[PDB]
Amino acid sequence: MRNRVSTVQQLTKRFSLGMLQGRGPLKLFMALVAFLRFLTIPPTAGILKRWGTIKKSKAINVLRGFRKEIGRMLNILNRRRR
Amino acid sequence: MRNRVSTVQQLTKRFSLGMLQGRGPLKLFMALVAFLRFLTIPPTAGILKRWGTIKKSKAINVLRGFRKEIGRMLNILNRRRR
């Protein structure tokens, strides 16, 4: 009964047989990781272990762009995009 | 056929018969919306139309917390959590 992590098993059970890939595009990866971590469900073990495929530059820019998009949407919601 | 929006149809077709709820917790909602918008897939029509259930305060704080978590993870990745 050694489950690696319920996060990946979720993705495995998703639909029927999920594709448990370590991702590639940091947008997709970080979006998925964000979706997990910001909701409540702990990110997949390999994420906390090796961050999948996060290089400490492009992924950083990805995060920057992410919070930028968030700031834009925040501006839209609060400021009505002025 | 007249497809409302491929985004919701995705969620409909997901697994078998997805639960097309307008969400409730802004964390879940915004996480889902973020996952969509940051990846590439346009957010569900009702999101661009009425933002689902976004009130221009708690959702704003949700966005703040989101970009905060992003900044924290960014700090972890780049600064190694100092």
CSV table of N, CA and C in Angstrom, one decimal, unseen atoms left out:
chain,number,residue,atom,x,y,z
A,1,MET,N,0.8,-1.2,0.0
A,1,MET,CA,0.0,0.0,0.0
A,1,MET,C,0.9,1.3,0.0
A,2,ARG,N,2.0,1.2,-0.6
A,2,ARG,CA,2.9,2.3,-0.7
A,2,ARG,C,2.5,3.3,-1.8
A,3,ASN,N,1.7,4.2,-1.5
A,3,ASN,CA,1.3,5.3,-2.4
A,3,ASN,C,2.4,6.3,-2.5
A,4,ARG,N,2.9,6.6,-3.7
A,4,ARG,CA,3.9,7.6,-3.9
A,4,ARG,C,3.5,8.9,-3.4
A,5,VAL,N,2.3,9.3,-3.8
A,5,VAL,CA,1.7,10.6,-3.4
A,5,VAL,C,0.3,10.7,-4.1
A,6,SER,N,-0.7,11.1,-3.3
A,6,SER,CA,-2.1,11.1,-3.7
A,6,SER,C,-2.3,12.1,-4.8
A,7,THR,N,-1.4,13.1,-5.0
A,7,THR,CA,-1.5,14.1,-6.0
A,7,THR,C,-1.3,13.4,-7.4
A,8,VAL,N,-0.3,12.5,-7.5
A,8,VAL,CA,0.0,11.9,-8.8
A,8,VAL,C,-1.1,10.8,-9.1
A,9,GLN,N,-1.5,10.2,-8.0
A,9,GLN,CA,-2.5,9.1,-8.1
A,9,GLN,C,-3.8,9.7,-8.5
A,10,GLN,N,-4.1,11.0,-8.1
A,10,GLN,CA,-5.2,11.7,-8.6
A,10,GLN,C,-5.2,11.9,-10.1
A,11,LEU,N,-4.0,12.3,-10.6
A,11,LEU,CA,-3.8,12.5,-12.0
A,11,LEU,C,-3.8,11.1,-12.8
A,12,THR,N,-3.4,10.1,-12.1
A,12,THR,CA,-3.5,8.7,-12.6
A,12,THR,C,-4.9,8.3,-12.8
A,13,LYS,N,-5.7,8.5,-11.7
A,13,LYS,CA,-7.1,8.0,-11.7
A,13,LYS,C,-8.0,8.9,-12.5
A,14,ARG,N,-7.5,10.2,-12.8
A,14,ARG,CA,-8.3,11.1,-13.6
A,14,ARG,C,-8.6,10.6,-14.9
A,15,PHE,N,-9.9,10.6,-15.2
A,15,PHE,CA,-10.5,10.1,-16.5
A,15,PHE,C,-10.5,8.6,-16.5
A,16,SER,N,-9.3,8.0,-16.5
A,16,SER,CA,-9.2,6.6,-16.5
A,16,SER,C,-7.7,6.2,-16.2
A,17,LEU,N,-6.9,6.5,-17.2
A,17,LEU,CA,-5.5,6.3,-17.1
A,17,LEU,C,-4.7,7.6,-17.5
A,18,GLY,N,-4.5,8.5,-16.5
A,18,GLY,CA,-3.8,9.7,-16.8
A,18,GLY,C,-2.4,9.6,-17.3
A,19,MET,N,-1.9,10.6,-18.0
A,19,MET,CA,-0.5,10.5,-18.4
A,19,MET,C,0.4,11.2,-17.4
A,20,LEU,N,1.1,10.4,-16.6
A,20,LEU,CA,1.9,10.9,-15.5
A,20,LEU,C,3.2,11.4,-16.1
A,21,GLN,N,3.2,12.5,-16.8
A,21,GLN,CA,4.4,13.1,-17.3
A,21,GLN,C,4.9,14.1,-16.4
A,22,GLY,N,6.3,14.3,-16.4
A,22,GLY,CA,6.9,15.3,-15.5
A,22,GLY,C,6.8,16.7,-16.1
A,23,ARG,N,5.9,16.9,-17.1
A,23,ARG,CA,5.6,18.2,-17.7
A,23,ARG,C,6.8,18.6,-18.5
A,24,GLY,N,6.7,19.8,-19.2
A,24,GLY,CA,7.8,20.3,-20.0
A,24,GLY,C,7.8,21.9,-20.0
A,25,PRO,N,6.7,22.5,-20.5
A,25,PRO,CA,6.5,23.9,-20.4
A,25,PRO,C,6.3,24.3,-19.0
A,26,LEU,N,7.0,25.3,-18.5
A,26,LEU,CA,7.0,25.8,-17.2
A,26,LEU,C,5.7,26.5,-16.9
A,27,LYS,N,5.1,27.0,-18.0
A,27,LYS,CA,3.7,27.6,-17.8
A,27,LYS,C,2.7,26.6,-17.4
A,28,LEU,N,2.7,25.5,-18.1
A,28,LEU,CA,1.8,24.4,-17.8
A,28,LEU,C,2.2,23.8,-16.5
A,29,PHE,N,3.4,23.5,-16.2
A,29,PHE,CA,3.9,23.0,-15.0
A,29,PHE,C,3.5,23.9,-13.8
A,30,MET,N,3.9,25.1,-13.9
A,30,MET,CA,3.7,26.1,-12.8
A,30,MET,C,2.2,26.3,-12.6
A,31,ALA,N,1.4,26.3,-13.7
A,31,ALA,CA,0.0,26.5,-13.6
A,31,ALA,C,-0.6,25.3,-12.9
A,32,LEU,N,-0.2,24.1,-13.2
A,32,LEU,CA,-0.6,22.9,-12.5
A,32,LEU,C,-0.2,22.9,-11.0
A,33,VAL,N,1.0,23.3,-10.8
A,33,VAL,CA,1.5,23.4,-9.4
A,33,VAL,C,0.8,24.4,-8.6
A,34,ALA,N,0.5,25.6,-9.3
A,34,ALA,CA,-0.2,26.6,-8.7
A,34,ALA,C,-1.6,26.2,-8.3
A,35,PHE,N,-2.3,25.6,-9.3
A,35,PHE,CA,-3.6,25.1,-9.1
A,35,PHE,C,-3.7,24.2,-7.9
A,36,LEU,N,-2.7,23.3,-7.7
A,36,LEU,CA,-2.6,22.4,-6.6
A,36,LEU,C,-2.3,23.2,-5.3
A,37,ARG,N,-1.2,23.9,-5.2
A,37,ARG,CA,-0.8,24.5,-4.0
A,37,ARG,C,-1.7,25.6,-3.5
A,38,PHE,N,-2.3,26.3,-4.4
A,38,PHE,CA,-3.1,27.4,-4.0
A,38,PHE,C,-4.5,27.0,-3.6
A,39,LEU,N,-4.9,25.8,-4.1
A,39,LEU,CA,-6.2,25.2,-3.7
A,39,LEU,C,-6.1,24.7,-2.2
A,40,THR,N,-5.3,23.6,-2.1
A,40,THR,CA,-5.1,23.0,-0.8
A,40,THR,C,-4.3,21.7,-0.9
A,41,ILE,N,-4.6,21.0,-2.0
A,41,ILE,CA,-3.9,19.7,-2.3
A,41,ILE,C,-2.4,19.9,-2.5
A,42,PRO,N,-1.6,19.2,-1.6
A,42,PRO,CA,-0.1,19.3,-1.7
A,42,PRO,C,0.4,18.9,-3.1
A,43,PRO,N,1.3,19.7,-3.7
A,43,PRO,CA,1.9,19.4,-5.0
A,43,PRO,C,2.5,18.0,-5.0
A,44,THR,N,2.7,17.4,-6.2
A,44,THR,CA,3.2,16.1,-6.4
A,44,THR,C,4.6,16.0,-5.8
A,45,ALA,N,5.0,14.9,-5.2
A,45,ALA,CA,6.2,14.7,-4.5
A,45,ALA,C,7.4,15.2,-5.3
A,46,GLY,N,7.5,14.8,-6.5
A,46,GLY,CA,8.6,15.2,-7.4
A,46,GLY,C,8.8,16.7,-7.5
A,47,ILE,N,7.7,17.4,-7.2
A,47,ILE,CA,7.7,18.9,-7.3
A,47,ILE,C,8.4,19.4,-6.0
A,48,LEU,N,8.1,18.9,-4.9
A,48,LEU,CA,8.7,19.3,-3.6
A,48,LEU,C,10.1,18.8,-3.6
A,49,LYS,N,10.3,17.7,-4.3
A,49,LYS,CA,11.6,17.0,-4.3
A,49,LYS,C,12.6,17.7,-5.2
A,50,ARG,N,12.2,17.8,-6.5
A,50,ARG,CA,13.1,18.3,-7.5
A,50,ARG,C,12.5,19.4,-8.4
A,51,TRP,N,11.3,19.8,-8.0
A,51,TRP,CA,10.5,20.8,-8.7
A,51,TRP,C,10.3,20.5,-10.1
A,52,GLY,N,10.2,19.2,-10.4
A,52,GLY,CA,10.0,18.7,-11.8
A,52,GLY,C,11.1,19.1,-12.7
A,53,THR,N,10.9,20.2,-13.4
A,53,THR,CA,11.8,20.7,-14.4
A,53,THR,C,12.0,22.2,-14.3
A,54,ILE,N,12.0,22.7,-13.0
A,54,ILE,CA,12.2,24.1,-12.7
A,54,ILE,C,13.6,24.5,-12.8
A,55,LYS,N,14.0,25.3,-13.8
A,55,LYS,CA,15.3,26.0,-13.8
A,55,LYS,C,15.1,27.3,-13.2
A,56,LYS,N,16.1,27.7,-12.3
A,56,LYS,CA,15.9,28.9,-11.5
A,56,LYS,C,16.2,30.2,-12.3
A,57,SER,N,15.5,30.3,-13.4
A,57,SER,CA,15.6,31.5,-14.3
A,57,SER,C,14.3,31.7,-15.1
A,58,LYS,N,14.1,30.8,-16.0
A,58,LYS,CA,12.9,30.8,-16.9
A,58,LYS,C,11.6,30.6,-16.0
A,59,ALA,N,11.7,29.7,-15.1
A,59,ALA,CA,10.6,29.4,-14.2
A,59,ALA,C,10.3,30.6,-13.3
A,60,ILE,N,11.4,31.3,-13.0
A,60,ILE,CA,11.3,32.6,-12.2
A,60,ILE,C,10.5,33.6,-13.0
A,61,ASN,N,10.9,33.7,-14.3
A,61,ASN,CA,10.2,34.6,-15.2
A,61,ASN,C,8.8,34.2,-15.4
A,62,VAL,N,8.6,32.9,-15.4
A,62,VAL,CA,7.2,32.3,-15.5
A,62,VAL,C,6.4,32.8,-14.3
A,63,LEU,N,7.0,32.6,-13.1
A,63,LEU,CA,6.3,33.1,-11.9
A,63,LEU,C,6.0,34.6,-11.9
A,64,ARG,N,7.0,35.3,-12.4
A,64,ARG,CA,6.8,36.8,-12.5
A,64,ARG,C,5.7,37.1,-13.4
A,65,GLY,N,5.6,36.4,-14.6
A,65,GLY,CA,4.6,36.6,-15.5
A,65,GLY,C,3.2,36.2,-15.0
A,66,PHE,N,3.3,35.1,-14.2
A,66,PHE,CA,2.1,34.6,-13.5
A,66,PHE,C,1.5,35.7,-12.6
A,67,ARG,N,2.3,36.2,-11.7
A,67,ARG,CA,1.8,37.2,-10.7
A,67,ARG,C,1.5,38.5,-11.5
A,68,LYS,N,2.2,38.7,-12.6
A,68,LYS,CA,1.9,39.8,-13.5
A,68,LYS,C,0.4,39.7,-14.0
A,69,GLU,N,0.1,38.5,-14.6
A,69,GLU,CA,-1.2,38.3,-15.1
A,69,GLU,C,-2.2,38.4,-13.9
A,70,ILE,N,-1.9,37.9,-12.8
A,70,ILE,CA,-2.7,38.0,-11.6
A,70,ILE,C,-2.9,39.5,-11.2
A,71,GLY,N,-1.8,40.3,-11.3
A,71,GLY,CA,-1.9,41.7,-11.0
A,71,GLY,C,-2.8,42.4,-12.1
A,72,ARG,N,-2.7,42.0,-13.3
A,72,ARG,CA,-3.5,42.5,-14.4
A,72,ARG,C,-5.0,42.2,-14.1
A,73,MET,N,-5.3,41.0,-13.8
A,73,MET,CA,-6.7,40.6,-13.5
A,73,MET,C,-7.2,41.3,-12.2
A,74,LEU,N,-6.3,41.4,-11.3
A,74,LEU,CA,-6.6,42.2,-10.1
A,74,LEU,C,-6.9,43.6,-10.4
A,75,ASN,N,-6.1,44.2,-11.3
A,75,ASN,CA,-6.4,45.5,-11.8
A,75,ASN,C,-7.7,45.6,-12.5
A,76,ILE,N,-8.0,44.6,-13.3
A,76,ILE,CA,-9.3,44.5,-14.0
A,76,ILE,C,-10.5,44.5,-13.0
A,77,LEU,N,-10.4,43.6,-12.0
A,77,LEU,CA,-11.4,43.4,-11.0
A,77,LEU,C,-11.6,44.6,-10.1
A,78,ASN,N,-10.5,45.1,-9.6
A,78,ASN,CA,-10.5,46.2,-8.6
A,78,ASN,C,-10.6,47.6,-9.3
A,79,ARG,N,-9.7,47.7,-10.3
A,79,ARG,CA,-9.5,49.0,-10.9
A,79,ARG,C,-10.4,49.2,-12.2
A,80,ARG,N,-10.9,48.0,-12.7
A,80,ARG,CA,-11.7,48.0,-13.9
A,80,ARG,C,-10.8,48.2,-15.1
A,81,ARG,N,-9.5,47.9,-15.0
A,81,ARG,CA,-8.6,48.0,-16.1
A,81,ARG,C,-8.5,49.5,-16.5
A,82,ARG,N,-7.8,50.3,-15.7
A,82,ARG,CA,-7.6,51.7,-16.1
A,82,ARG,C,-6.1,51.8,-16.5
B,1,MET,CA,-23.8,23.3,-33.1
B,1,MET,C,-23.3,24.5,-32.3
B,2,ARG,N,-24.3,25.1,-31.5
B,2,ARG,CA,-23.9,26.2,-30.7
B,2,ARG,C,-23.2,25.8,-29.4
B,3,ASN,N,-21.9,25.7,-29.4
B,3,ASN,CA,-21.2,25.5,-28.2
B,3,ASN,C,-21.0,26.7,-27.4
B,4,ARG,N,-21.4,26.6,-26.1
B,4,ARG,CA,-21.3,27.8,-25.2
B,4,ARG,C,-19.9,28.3,-25.1
B,5,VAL,N,-19.0,27.4,-24.9
B,5,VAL,CA,-17.6,27.6,-24.8
B,5,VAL,C,-16.8,26.3,-24.5
B,6,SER,N,-15.7,26.2,-25.3
B,6,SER,CA,-15.0,24.9,-25.2
B,6,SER,C,-14.4,24.6,-23.9
B,7,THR,N,-14.2,25.7,-23.1
B,7,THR,CA,-13.7,25.6,-21.7
B,7,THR,C,-14.6,24.8,-20.8
B,8,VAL,N,-15.9,25.1,-20.9
B,8,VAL,CA,-16.9,24.4,-20.0
B,8,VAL,C,-17.1,23.0,-20.6
B,9,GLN,N,-17.1,22.9,-21.9
B,9,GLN,CA,-17.3,21.6,-22.5
B,9,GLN,C,-16.2,20.7,-22.2
B,10,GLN,N,-15.0,21.2,-22.1
B,10,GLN,CA,-13.8,20.5,-21.6
B,10,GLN,C,-14.1,19.9,-20.2
B,11,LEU,N,-14.6,20.7,-19.3
B,11,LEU,CA,-14.9,20.3,-18.0
B,11,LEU,C,-16.1,19.3,-18.0
B,12,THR,N,-17.0,19.5,-19.0
B,12,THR,CA,-18.1,18.6,-19.1
B,12,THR,C,-17.7,17.2,-19.6
B,13,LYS,N,-16.8,17.2,-20.6
B,13,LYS,CA,-16.3,15.9,-21.1
B,13,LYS,C,-15.3,15.3,-20.2
B,14,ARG,N,-14.6,16.1,-19.3
B,14,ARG,CA,-13.7,15.6,-18.4
B,14,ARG,C,-14.2,14.4,-17.6
B,15,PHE,N,-13.5,13.3,-17.6
B,15,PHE,CA,-13.8,12.1,-16.9
B,15,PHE,C,-15.0,11.3,-17.6
B,16,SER,N,-16.1,12.0,-17.7
B,16,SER,CA,-17.3,11.4,-18.3
B,16,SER,C,-18.4,12.5,-18.3
B,17,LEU,N,-18.9,12.8,-17.1
B,17,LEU,CA,-19.9,13.9,-17.0
B,17,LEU,C,-19.4,14.8,-15.9
B,18,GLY,N,-18.7,15.9,-16.2
B,18,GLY,CA,-18.2,16.8,-15.2
B,18,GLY,C,-19.3,17.6,-14.5
B,19,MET,N,-19.0,18.1,-13.3
B,19,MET,CA,-20.0,18.9,-12.6
B,19,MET,C,-19.7,20.4,-13.0
B,20,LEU,N,-20.6,20.9,-13.8
B,20,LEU,CA,-20.4,22.3,-14.3
B,20,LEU,C,-21.0,23.3,-13.3
B,21,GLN,N,-20.3,23.4,-12.2
B,21,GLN,CA,-20.8,24.3,-11.1
B,21,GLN,C,-20.0,25.6,-11.3
B,22,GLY,N,-20.6,26.7,-10.9
B,22,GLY,CA,-20.0,28.0,-11.0
B,22,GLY,C,-19.0,28.3,-9.9
B,23,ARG,N,-18.6,27.2,-9.2
B,23,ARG,CA,-17.7,27.3,-8.1
B,23,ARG,C,-18.2,28.1,-6.9
B,24,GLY,N,-17.4,28.2,-5.9
B,24,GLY,CA,-17.9,28.9,-4.7
B,24,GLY,C,-16.7,29.5,-4.0
B,25,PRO,N,-15.7,28.8,-3.5
B,25,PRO,CA,-14.5,29.3,-2.9
B,25,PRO,C,-13.7,30.0,-4.0
B,26,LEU,N,-13.3,31.2,-3.7
B,26,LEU,CA,-12.5,32.0,-4.7
B,26,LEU,C,-11.1,31.5,-4.9
B,27,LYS,N,-10.6,30.7,-3.9
B,27,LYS,CA,-9.4,30.1,-4.0
B,27,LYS,C,-9.5,29.0,-5.2
B,28,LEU,N,-10.5,28.2,-5.1
B,28,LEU,CA,-10.7,27.1,-6.1
B,28,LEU,C,-11.0,27.8,-7.4
B,29,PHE,N,-11.9,28.8,-7.4
B,29,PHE,CA,-12.3,29.5,-8.6
B,29,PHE,C,-11.1,30.1,-9.3
B,30,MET,N,-10.4,30.9,-8.5
B,30,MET,CA,-9.3,31.7,-9.1
B,30,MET,C,-8.1,30.7,-9.5
B,31,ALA,N,-8.0,29.6,-8.7
B,31,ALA,CA,-7.0,28.7,-9.1
B,31,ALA,C,-7.3,28.0,-10.5
B,32,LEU,N,-8.5,27.7,-10.6
B,32,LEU,CA,-9.0,27.1,-11.9
B,32,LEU,C,-8.9,28.1,-13.0
B,33,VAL,N,-9.3,29.4,-12.8
B,33,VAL,CA,-9.2,30.4,-13.8
B,33,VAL,C,-7.8,30.7,-14.1
B,34,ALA,N,-6.9,30.7,-13.1
B,34,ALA,CA,-5.5,31.0,-13.3
B,34,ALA,C,-4.9,29.8,-14.1
B,35,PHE,N,-5.2,28.6,-13.8
B,35,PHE,CA,-4.8,27.4,-14.5
B,35,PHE,C,-5.1,27.6,-16.0
B,36,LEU,N,-6.3,28.0,-16.2
B,36,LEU,CA,-6.8,28.2,-17.6
B,36,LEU,C,-6.0,29.3,-18.3
B,37,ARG,N,-6.2,30.5,-17.7
B,37,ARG,CA,-5.7,31.7,-18.4
B,37,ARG,C,-4.1,31.8,-18.5
B,38,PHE,N,-3.4,31.2,-17.5
B,38,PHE,CA,-2.0,31.2,-17.6
B,38,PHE,C,-1.4,30.2,-18.5
B,39,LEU,N,-2.2,29.1,-18.7
B,39,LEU,CA,-1.7,28.1,-19.7
B,39,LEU,C,-1.9,28.6,-21.1
B,40,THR,N,-3.1,28.8,-21.5
B,40,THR,CA,-3.4,29.3,-22.9
B,40,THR,C,-4.9,29.2,-23.2
B,41,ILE,N,-5.6,28.2,-22.6
B,41,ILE,CA,-7.0,28.0,-22.8
B,41,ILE,C,-7.8,29.2,-22.2
B,42,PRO,N,-8.6,29.8,-23.1
B,42,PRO,CA,-9.5,30.9,-22.6
B,42,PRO,C,-10.4,30.5,-21.5
B,43,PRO,N,-10.5,31.3,-20.4
B,43,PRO,CA,-11.4,31.0,-19.3
B,43,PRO,C,-12.8,30.9,-19.8
B,44,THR,N,-13.6,30.2,-19.0
B,44,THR,CA,-15.0,29.9,-19.3
B,44,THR,C,-15.8,31.2,-19.5
B,45,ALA,N,-16.7,31.2,-20.5
B,45,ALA,CA,-17.4,32.4,-20.8
B,45,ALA,C,-18.0,33.2,-19.6
B,46,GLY,N,-18.6,32.5,-18.7
B,46,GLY,CA,-19.2,33.1,-17.5
B,46,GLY,C,-18.1,33.9,-16.7
B,47,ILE,N,-16.9,33.5,-16.9
B,47,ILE,CA,-15.8,34.1,-16.2
B,47,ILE,C,-15.5,35.5,-16.8
B,48,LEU,N,-15.4,35.6,-18.1
B,48,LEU,CA,-15.2,36.8,-18.7
B,48,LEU,C,-16.4,37.7,-18.7
B,49,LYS,N,-17.6,37.0,-18.6
B,49,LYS,CA,-18.8,37.7,-18.6
B,49,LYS,C,-19.2,38.3,-17.2
B,50,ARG,N,-19.2,37.4,-16.2
B,50,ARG,CA,-19.6,37.9,-14.9
B,50,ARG,C,-18.5,37.5,-13.8
B,51,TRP,N,-17.4,36.9,-14.2
B,51,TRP,CA,-16.3,36.5,-13.3
B,51,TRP,C,-16.9,35.5,-12.3
B,52,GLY,N,-17.9,34.7,-12.7
B,52,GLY,CA,-18.4,33.7,-11.8
B,52,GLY,C,-19.0,34.3,-10.6
B,53,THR,N,-18.2,34.2,-9.5
B,53,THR,CA,-18.6,34.7,-8.2
B,53,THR,C,-17.5,35.6,-7.6
B,54,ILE,N,-16.9,36.4,-8.4
B,54,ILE,CA,-15.8,37.3,-7.9
B,54,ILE,C,-16.4,38.6,-7.4
B,55,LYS,N,-16.3,38.7,-6.1
B,55,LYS,CA,-16.6,40.0,-5.4
B,55,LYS,C,-15.3,40.8,-5.3
B,56,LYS,N,-15.3,42.1,-5.6
B,56,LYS,CA,-14.1,42.9,-5.8
B,56,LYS,C,-13.5,43.3,-4.4
B,57,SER,N,-13.3,42.3,-3.6
B,57,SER,CA,-12.6,42.5,-2.3
B,57,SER,C,-11.9,41.2,-1.9
B,58,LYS,N,-12.7,40.2,-1.5
B,58,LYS,CA,-12.2,38.9,-1.1
B,58,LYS,C,-11.4,38.2,-2.2
B,59,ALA,N,-11.9,38.4,-3.5
B,59,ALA,CA,-11.3,37.8,-4.6
B,59,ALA,C,-9.9,38.6,-4.9
B,60,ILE,N,-9.9,39.8,-4.6
B,60,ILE,CA,-8.7,40.7,-4.7
B,60,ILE,C,-7.7,40.2,-3.7
B,61,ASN,N,-8.1,39.9,-2.5
B,61,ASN,CA,-7.3,39.4,-1.4
B,61,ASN,C,-6.8,38.0,-1.8
B,62,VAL,N,-7.7,37.2,-2.5
B,62,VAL,CA,-7.3,35.9,-3.0
B,62,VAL,C,-6.2,36.0,-4.0
B,63,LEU,N,-6.3,37.0,-4.9
B,63,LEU,CA,-5.3,37.3,-5.9
B,63,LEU,C,-4.0,37.7,-5.3
B,64,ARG,N,-4.1,38.6,-4.3
B,64,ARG,CA,-2.9,39.0,-3.5
B,64,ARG,C,-2.2,37.8,-2.9
B,65,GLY,N,-3.0,37.0,-2.2
B,65,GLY,CA,-2.5,35.8,-1.6
B,65,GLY,C,-1.8,34.8,-2.6
B,66,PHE,N,-2.5,34.7,-3.8
B,66,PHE,CA,-2.0,33.9,-4.8
B,66,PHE,C,-0.6,34.4,-5.3
B,67,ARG,N,-0.5,35.7,-5.6
B,67,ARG,CA,0.8,36.2,-6.1
B,67,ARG,C,1.8,36.2,-4.9
B,68,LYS,N,1.3,36.3,-3.7
B,68,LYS,CA,2.1,36.1,-2.5
B,68,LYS,C,2.7,34.7,-2.5
B,69,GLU,N,1.9,33.7,-2.6
B,69,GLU,CA,2.4,32.3,-2.7
B,69,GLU,C,3.4,32.2,-3.8
B,70,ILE,N,3.1,32.8,-4.9
B,70,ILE,CA,4.0,32.8,-6.1
B,70,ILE,C,5.3,33.4,-5.7
B,71,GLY,N,5.2,34.6,-5.1
B,71,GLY,CA,6.4,35.3,-4.6
B,71,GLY,C,7.2,34.4,-3.7
B,72,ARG,N,6.5,33.7,-2.8
B,72,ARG,CA,7.2,32.8,-1.8
B,72,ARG,C,7.9,31.7,-2.6
B,73,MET,N,7.2,31.0,-3.5
B,73,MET,CA,7.8,30.0,-4.3
B,73,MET,C,9.0,30.5,-5.1
B,74,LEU,N,8.8,31.7,-5.6
B,74,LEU,CA,9.8,32.4,-6.4
B,74,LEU,C,11.0,32.6,-5.5
B,75,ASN,N,10.8,33.0,-4.3
B,75,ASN,CA,11.8,33.2,-3.3
B,75,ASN,C,12.5,31.9,-3.0
B,76,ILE,N,11.7,30.8,-2.9
B,76,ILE,CA,12.3,29.5,-2.7
B,76,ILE,C,13.2,29.1,-3.8
B,77,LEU,N,12.7,29.2,-5.0
B,77,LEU,CA,13.4,28.8,-6.2
B,77,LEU,C,14.7,29.6,-6.4
B,78,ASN,N,14.5,30.9,-6.4
B,78,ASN,CA,15.6,31.9,-6.7
B,78,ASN,C,16.5,32.1,-5.5
B,79,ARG,N,15.9,32.4,-4.4
B,79,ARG,CA,16.6,32.8,-3.2
B,79,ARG,C,16.9,31.6,-2.3
B,80,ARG,N,16.2,30.5,-2.5
B,80,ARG,CA,16.3,29.3,-1.7
B,80,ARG,C,15.7,29.5,-0.3
B,81,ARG,N,14.7,30.4,-0.3
B,81,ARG,CA,14.0,30.6,1.0
B,81,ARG,C,14.9,31.2,2.1
B,82,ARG,N,15.3,32.4,1.9
B,82,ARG,CA,16.1,33.0,2.9
B,82,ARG,C,15.3,34.0,3.7
